[PDB]
């Protein structure tokens, strides 16, 4: 269902504060979405 996108450097916490996009779809697990 969810499993890594890329390296920790693509995903950041900056995502997590203004990107949904990245939260659930570009950041399976990363995010602390999954």
């Given at each position: ?29 990363t995010?602390?979405?999954?």
């Amino acid at each position: 269902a969810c499993k890594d996108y890329l390296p920790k450097s693509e995903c950041t916490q900056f995502r997590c504060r203004t990107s949904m996009k990245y939260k659930y779809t570009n950041c399976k697990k990363t995010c602390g979405t999954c």
